[PDB]
Design a protein around this ligand. Structure first.
Ligand code: NA
Ligand code: NA
Ligand code: NA
Ligand SMILES: [Zn+2]
Lengths: 243, 147, 936
RNA sequence: CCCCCGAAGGGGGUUUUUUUUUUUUA
């Protein structure tokens, strides 16, 4: 036990209840490895996301005549935590659930129907982890998919919100994720509509809505950030390509 | 099924002398139930998009349809799915909206509350049926001790 | 490297190395820097603009005085910045109402204090929390402000960095407040600064001497006999891993402050610790590590009465010595002894005492060393330095104990507070409540705001279907209307807060409907609120002879929750359907609304019951309740109950008495149904929440506590008691009767109960079911439900009963085992302390009456020593110690027969040999001289 | 149905450890 939230309204890392961690993103970081790519840092979370495709299906199975196939591979490296994990995570049910979640998230956002008989492989490497990793994965995927030139309806911004007693804390780190229940949100664009809503630990019903309220807002900010990068990276690489 | 089973289940009484334990058939000592702390119940909402995807992503007047406990025919045609687990302590045990059709947050909240309304009935039903089972067992024993 | 962010924000990477036992793990965290940290001064103009609201949308209060205490040059307009050490040493001075009015507490200091001492951290946080006009303490997050954050240099210990951070804090403060001229004084004792390019740095004593009221508080600061020095940590842990040493808490003898004992797991009896050296500066309640002494120094349990006022190798053989220790512990008079070698934990709360006239000198105007005799007679006298000796001579004071070096024969301490002249009502009362750590301060406004805004104007809704009342309260629809019930309450004459009320009516079944209705306090107190917090901290209402310390604010207790007559009141009601044999055929638990038809006194109710001219239906119901209670009590007697009502005594001279509660059938009437209620509620809430049910158990005692008493019995009275079962002890107690003295039996029951174990509150998950048993009541399960106004246990049980019936979802705080563990330990401690306080107050006042008024009372010798006897005056239920000096002239000639339990002496007033045995009926009288109970 | 021819044929749907019991109670 320790002051997760001081009477002064500060946290252990020195943030307030409604402030995001440091969020920085980079696009087209692996031009020789994938069609789209993104390197992303959220707090201490460091993630490489690679989008390969749309491309010819490896098997002449897994081929859909009406739409593209979307696969997601999440690699949580053994050195992502402070203590190295002697076990791989690749076939853990947690990781499979995360993968299927991301797939079913971007099946409804990515216009797969305009890429029939193709496969879109998403390859993710979590280099460093510090809580709220799901939203980070979401953001990385969005960035990398947009970098690939693959059509989609909107951004999807991922964020996490913890619930300490009565007060909700925005964008929780590892220490906050422990000794507290957290809600992960996948928000579509600037809308109030949720692509993802994940609650894995017990939360008082009557206080859930409030937790969403800030969450959405936070996600919006995240969108504004990702956007802000893309435009710049666009503005830079559309002016230099000229003459 | 899992909850009702866990609450219905009884492990054989045992006692312990250091290194060794002593396990009993029913005749030796009566069995004792497990420690149930709360009764989590899941409710699954299915989401259908009546209009086009464009209306869902960038359209007002949300026409997204939600139903409860979809059949197979309904489950095969749905565009989204949410599973909310609650107990009679008004606790959100868990919530899973693993992608699918984007839904407005308020609608999801309403879903959670209606789900609570359902898990009340289901929980009371489970408890009732349990107690009736135990009572019938006891009365059977009473019918067995004297012909 | 650090990165700047969107809104006056920043981030760096705090990197360090955690060393969990046997390992190394490097830890990396992100440390955010800010530009909106407020100085919280009323004089600052800039900070109130850059400040932002919290999660509640709240702008932190600027509380530091615009005009602080001003001193002599080069100090004007000063604030105080503390250091960790200064806080640790002078925490009790930081709480002193007449100094340190404006103090800044740096974050890093808060953290350090927290790391080295959590209670002191809690007291400091309390200071920062309850800041007002009288005292102002703030917390400044110097670590999160870029203006003050210093980063650690290589090859530098944490201490240098911490103190440099405090230094930078002081510097930024001086630079920030100087436009107003507020200076800051860094008070520290650690030689911090070698002249660099500054800040006022004064030690504690220096800052004290710069104060106007220095002489008042100068002595409120810590400063060939040789004790054996404590072992080292490696030595004691090595000794514990080898099973050589044993850890545990030491309890000092009740009448000998130099004899103690330690409870040990495999040992049948607690191992004795005798003598100053063997005790080794340990205190009562301290957590110690002990080592077994050779059989050469094993000792028989001392039969001496000693006060601080009246007191001037091979390992294998060590564990086999433990074996011999056990096997001799079972069967030898001379019990195995031990010595303490290390103090693991130390109580060291504030102690109430009085200066010893011997050590003072009225003539000496200079500072001197005096001795203070503590109220707790299990503790040594403490040495204090002061110049106010002649003023504190006959005044009850509070002191703090600083340390006890091996060179000093006594512990070193310092003065804290004067409570008033001895034998003053206020002084003795406050001293009494302080000695048992009873909270007696008035409720804060944050607590009073948790009260219903209606106030006394709160009404239970006439019709429950009212759309308005239901608009304000949805759960009201489940509330049952029992206002048709003829419900009455029976209580002592001085009663103001009514917790219970009863009713009874006949059923067509031939059965009986019996309703026990309890004050619905849950409806007014909610988890998380300040009211519930203060109500939780105060485990129960403490009852003194003259005053009552409430748990909850009066408005709830005196009015809103109390089951007053003639008015509608909310209640939690347990309704029963009983056989005529008072066997339970049905039971229900419902939140209800009632209206008491009458609030009887015990003798009023008894009179009305025995009165044959009154045959109103209410009276009939009361008689019914009576006989039903009789049947219940018979069933419990056959069940093997050991209930014993102790004399309840209260006084009320009311100006410028000792009223005694009488024994009536109505007492039993109320008691039996209260018991029934508590039982039923216990079962229900345990069935509801089998893990965190708020229960109360009574563990069975070992045969030891009892066969010392038994030894006395069949040595003198030729009688014995069976300890095999509860019913065995019960009827073997029924056997114990003296022909010429009818009262003796009850006395035996009293001492018997004193041999028994203490009952305790607990959550059900902590124990197996057969441990739920209440050995005293002879039942398998029990709790407290019937008195929520005056106990918090009843509150928890009420909430859980509300959860059991589906009325309202139980709070999380009562569903989590850890929080409930804290709660149980707290309410146990508070209950016990309340009991002790009550008994102490009764003893004091009764003593005062017997002293002022020359009075003879009957008594029974219940313990015999070679230098004193302890007798019990039964009508007050009060025990007292008579010393041999006082009892007899020529004590050296007196003889002590340990086997016969006999003290032979010659009374002072005129001589003739007098033998005094244990259990002897004597005549006691009280006269107080110094250098006091007496024998007639 | 797109693809040539000319005015119908041929080819194609993609097999973390921030460091003395009990009861009512002024
Ligand atoms: Na978004
Ligand atoms: Na925000
Ligand atoms: Na009050
Ligand atoms: Zn300022």
């Amino acid at each position: 036990r320790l002051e997760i939230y001081s009477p002064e309204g500060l946290r252990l890392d020195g943030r307030r209840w409604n402030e995001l961690r440091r969020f920085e993103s980079s696009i087209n970081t692996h031009p020789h490895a994938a069609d789209g790519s993104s390197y992303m840092e959220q707090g201490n979370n460091k993630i490489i996301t690679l989008v390969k495709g749309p491309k010819e299906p490896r098997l002449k199975s897994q081929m859909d005549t009406s739409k593209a196939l979307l696969n997601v591979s999440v690699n949580i490296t053994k050195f992502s935590k402070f203590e190295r994990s002697k076990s791989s995570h690749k076939n853990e049910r947690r990781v499979l659930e995360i993968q299927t979640s991301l797939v079913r998230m971007f099946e409804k956002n990515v216009m797969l129907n305009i890429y029939p008989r193709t496969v879109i492989d998403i390859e993710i490497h979590v280099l460093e982890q510090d809580g709220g990793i799901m939203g980070s994965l979401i953001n990385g995927i969005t960035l990398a998919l947009i970098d690939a030139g693959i059509s989609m309806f909107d951004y999807i911004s991922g964020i996490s919100v913890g619930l300490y007693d009565t007060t909700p804390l925005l964008d929780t780190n590892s220490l906050e994720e422990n000794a507290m229940s957290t809600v992960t949100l996948g928000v579509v664009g600037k809308s109030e509509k949720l692509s993802l809503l994940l609650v894995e630990d017990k939360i008082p019903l009557d206080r859930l809505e409030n937790v969403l309220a800030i969450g959405i807002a936070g996600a919006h900010r995240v969108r504004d950030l990702m956007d802000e990068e893309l435009r710049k990276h666009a503005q830079k690489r559309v002016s230099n390509a000229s003459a | 099924a899992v909850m009702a089973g866990l609450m219905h289940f009884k492990k054989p009484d045992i006692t312990v002398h250091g290194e060794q334990i002593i396990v009993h058939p029913v005749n030796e000592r009566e069995p004792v139930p497990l420690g149930i702390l709360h009764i989590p119940i899941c409710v699954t909402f299915s989401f259908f998009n009546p209009q086009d995807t464009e209306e869902n992503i960038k359209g007002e007047t949300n026409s997204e349809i939600s139903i409860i406990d979809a059949t197979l025919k309904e489950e095969l045609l749905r565009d989204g799915v949410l599973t909310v687990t609650l107990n009679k302590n008004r606790e959100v045990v868990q919530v899973s909206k693993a992608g699918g059709l984007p839904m407005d947050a308020l609608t999801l909240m309403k879903c959670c509350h209606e789900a609570y309304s359902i898990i009340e009935k289901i929980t009371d039903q489970i408890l009732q049926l349990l107690k009736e089972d135990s009572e019938k067992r006891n009365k059977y024993a009473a019918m067995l001790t004297s012909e | 490297r650090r990165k700047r962010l969107a809104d006056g924000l920043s981030v760096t990477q705090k990197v360090f190395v955690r060393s969990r036992n046997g390992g190394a793990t490097k830890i990396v965290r992100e440390h955010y820097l800010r530009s909106d940290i407020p100085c919280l001064s009323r004089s600052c103009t800039k900070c109130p603009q850059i400040v932002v609201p919290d999660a509640q949308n709240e702008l932190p209060k600027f509380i530091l005085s615009d005009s602080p205490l001003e001193l002599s040059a080069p100090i004007g307009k000063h604030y105080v910045v503390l250091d960790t050490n200064v806080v640790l040493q002078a925490i009790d001075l930081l709480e002193n109402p007449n100094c340190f009015f404006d103090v800044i507490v740096p974050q890093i200091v808060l953290d350090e204090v927290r790391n080295k001492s959590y209670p002191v951290y809690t007291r400091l946080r309390t200071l920062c929390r309850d800041s007002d006009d009288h005292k102002r303490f703030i917390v400044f997050h110097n670590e999160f402000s870029e203006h003050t954050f210093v980063e650690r240099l290589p090859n530098e210990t944490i201490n240098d960095r911490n103190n440099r951070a405090i230094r930078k804090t002081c510097q930024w403060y001086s630079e920030h407040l100087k436009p107003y001229d507020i200076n800051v004084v860094l008070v520290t004792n650690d030689r911090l600064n070698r002249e660099a390019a500054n800040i006022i740095t004064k030690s504690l004593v220096q800052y004290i001497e710069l104060l106007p009221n220095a002489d008042d508080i100068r002595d409120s600061i810590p400063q060939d006999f040789t004790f054996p020095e404590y072992y080292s940590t490696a030595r004691v842990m090595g000794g514990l891993k080898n099973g050589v040493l044993y850890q545990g808490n030491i309890q000092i003898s009740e009448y000998n402050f130099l004899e103690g004992s330690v409870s040990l797991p495999r040992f049948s009896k607690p191992v004795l610790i005798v003598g100053q050296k063997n005790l080794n500066r340990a205190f009562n309640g301290d957590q110690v590590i002990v080592e077994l002494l050779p059989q050469s120094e094993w000792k028989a349990p001392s039969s001496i009465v000693l006060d601080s006022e009246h007191f001037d190798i091979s390992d294998k053989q060590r564990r086999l010595l433990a074996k011999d220790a056990m096997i001799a512990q079972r069967s030898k008079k001379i019990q195995p002894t031990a010595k303490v070698v290390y103090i693991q934990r130390r109580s060291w709360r504030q102690y109430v005492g009085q200066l010893a006239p011997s050590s003072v000198d009225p003539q000496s105007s200079s500072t001197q060393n005096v001795f203070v005799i503590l109220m707790d007679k299990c503790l040594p006298k403490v040495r204090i330095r002061t110049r106010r000796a002649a003023e504190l001579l006959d005044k009850r004071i509070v002191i703090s104990i600083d340390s006890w070096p091996t060179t000093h024969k006594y512990p070193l301490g310092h003065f804290v507070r004067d409570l008033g002249t001895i034998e003053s009502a206020q002084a003795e009362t406050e001293a009494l409540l302080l000695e048992h750590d009873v909270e007696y301060r008035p409720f804060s406004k944050k607590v009073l705001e948790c009260l219903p805004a209606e106030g006394h104007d709160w009404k239970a809704p006439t019709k429950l279907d009212d759309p308005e009342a239901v608009s304000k309260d949805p759960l009201l629809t489940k509330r049952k209307d029992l206002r048709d019930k003829l419900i009455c309450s029976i209580d002592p004459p001085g009663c103001v807060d009514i917790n219970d009320a009863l009713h009874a009516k006949k059923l067509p079944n031939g059965n009986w409907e019996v309703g026990v209705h309890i004050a619905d306090v849950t409806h007014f107190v909610k988890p998380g609120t300040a009211l519930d917090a203060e109500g939780a901290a105060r485990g129960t209402s403490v009852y003194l002879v003259d005053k009552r310390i409430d748990m909850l604010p009066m408005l709830l207790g005196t009015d809103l929750c109390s089951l007053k007559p003639y008015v509608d009141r909310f209640a939690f009601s347990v309704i029963w359907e009983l056989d005529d044999s008072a066997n339970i055929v049905n039971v229900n638990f419902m939140k209800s609304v009632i209206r008491s038809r009458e609030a009887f006194s015990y003798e009023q109710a008894q009179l009305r019951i025995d009165d044959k001219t009154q045959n109103d239906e209410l009276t009939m119901g009361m008689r019914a309740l009576l006989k039903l209670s009789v049947k219940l009590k018979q069933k419990r007697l056959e069940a093997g109950a050991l209930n014993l009502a102790s004399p309840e005594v209260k006084v009320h001279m009311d100006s410028e008495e000792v009223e005694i509660k009488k024994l009536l059938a109505t007492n039993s009437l109320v008691e039996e149904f209260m018991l029934l209620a508590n039982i039923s509620v216990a079962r229900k809430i345990y069935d509801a929440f089998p893990q965190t049910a708020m229960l109360r158990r009574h563990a069975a005692p070992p045969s030891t506590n009892f066969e010392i008493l038994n030894e006395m019995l069949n040595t003198r009275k030729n009688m014995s008691i069976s300890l095999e079962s509860s019913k065995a002890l019960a009827d073997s107690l029924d056997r114990c009767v003296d022909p010429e003295d009818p009262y003796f039996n009850t006395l035996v029951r009293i001492m018997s109960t004193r041999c028994m174990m203490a009952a305790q509150y607990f959550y059900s998950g902590a124990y197996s079911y057969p441990d739920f048993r209440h050995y005293g009541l002879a039942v398998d399960i029990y709790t407290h439900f019937t008195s929520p106004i005056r106990r918090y246990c009843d509150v928890v049980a009420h909430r859980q009963l509300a959860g059991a019936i589906g009325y309202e979802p139980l709070s999380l705080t009562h569903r989590d085992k850890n929080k409930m563990d804290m709660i149980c330990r707290n309410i146990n401690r508070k209950h016990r302390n309340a009991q002790f306080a009550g008994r102490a107050s009764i003893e004091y006042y009764v003593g005062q009456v017997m002293r002022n008024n020359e009075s003879t009372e009957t008594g029974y010798v219940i313990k015999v020593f070679n230098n004193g006897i302890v007798v019990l005056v039964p009508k007050f239920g009060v025990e007292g110690l008579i010393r041999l000096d006082n009892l007899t002239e020529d004590p050296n000639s007196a003889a002590f027969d340990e086997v016969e339990y006999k003290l032979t002496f010659v009374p002072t007033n005129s001589d003739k040999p007098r033998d005094v045995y244990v259990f002897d009926k004597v005549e006691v009288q009280v006269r107080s001289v110094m250098d006091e109970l007496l024998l007639k």
